[PDB]
A paper describes a structure:
Type III secretion systems (T3SS) allow the transport of protein substrates directly across the double membrane of Gram-negative bacteria. Proteomic analyses have identified the major components of the sorting platform for the Salmonella typhimurium SPI-1 injectisome: the AAA+ ATPase InvC, its regulator OrgB and the proteins SpaO and OrgA4. Here we show that a novel, heterotypic interaction between SPOA domains serves as a scaffold for sorting platform assembly in both injectisome and flagellar T3SS. Our structures suggest a partial model for the subtype-specific assembly of the T3SS sorting platforms: the heterotypic interaction between SPOA domains within a given T3SS subtype functions as an adaptor for ATPase and its regulator through interaction with the APAR peptide.
Preliminary bioinformatic analyses suggested the presence of two putative SPOA domains in the carboxy-terminal half of SpaO, which we denote SPOA1 and SPOA2. We first determined the structure of the SPOA2 homodimer to 1.35 Å resolution. The SPOA2 homodimer structure is architecturally similar to its homologues: like two left hands grasping one another, an antiparallel beta-sheet ‘palm' of each protomer is grasped by the ‘fingers' of the other, with a ‘thumb' protruding from the top of the palm and strands from each protomer forming an antiparallel beta sheet on the ‘floor' of the assembly. The Salmonella SPOA2 homodimer superposes on its Yersinia and Pseudomonas homologues with 2.24 and 3.05 Å root mean squared deviation (r.m.s.d.), respectively. In both SPOA1,2 and the SPOA2 homodimer, interacting protomers each bury about 1,800 Å2 against their binding partner. It should be noted that SpaO(1–219) does not complement a full genomic deletion of spaO, demonstrating that SPOA2 is also necessary for T3SS function. Indeed, SPOA1,2 is sufficient to co-affinity purify OrgB–InvC. This construct contains a Val203GTG-to-Val203GTT mutation to prevent the duplicitous translation of SPOA2 from its cryptic internal translation start site, demonstrating that the SPOA2 homodimer is dispensable for SpaO–OrgB–InvC complex formation.
Residue numbers in the entry:
A (entry chain B): 2 to 69
B (entry chain A): 1 to 69
The structure:
Amino acid sequence: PVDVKLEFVLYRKNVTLAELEAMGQQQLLSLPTNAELNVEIMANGVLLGNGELVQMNDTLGVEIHEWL
Amino acid sequence: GPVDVKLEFVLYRKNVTLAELEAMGQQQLLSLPTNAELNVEIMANGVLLGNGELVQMNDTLGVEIHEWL
Ligand SMILES: [Ca+2]
Ligand SMILES: [Ca+2]
């Protein structure tokens, strides 16, 4: 099979084209509180699961709270 | 509609095989590559707009922009 496009998504939302332009004027973007508690694992547009950011000994990790 | 944009802040993305995805699904704690956090990608309708670095701010996480495309 062909490869699938896997993403670990820290935050997602719908915004308007105007808000998208506004965002580009910023140098530091705040994410909503607890975005780190809802990391979404997605592939080819399908939600696979969600989890939480963890600082491990040498990297960041994602602790899975649910595989769908 | 056309005014609507799907915005994503992506910590890590990769083209993976079905077998690799299967193996991932067996895990409870997934390690990300070293410094994935240095390349948080900002996507709009699946297209890369910019990238930055994950920062712990006072009340939330933030993304420090390093490049807008
Ligand atoms: Ca926790
Ligand atoms: Ca935590």
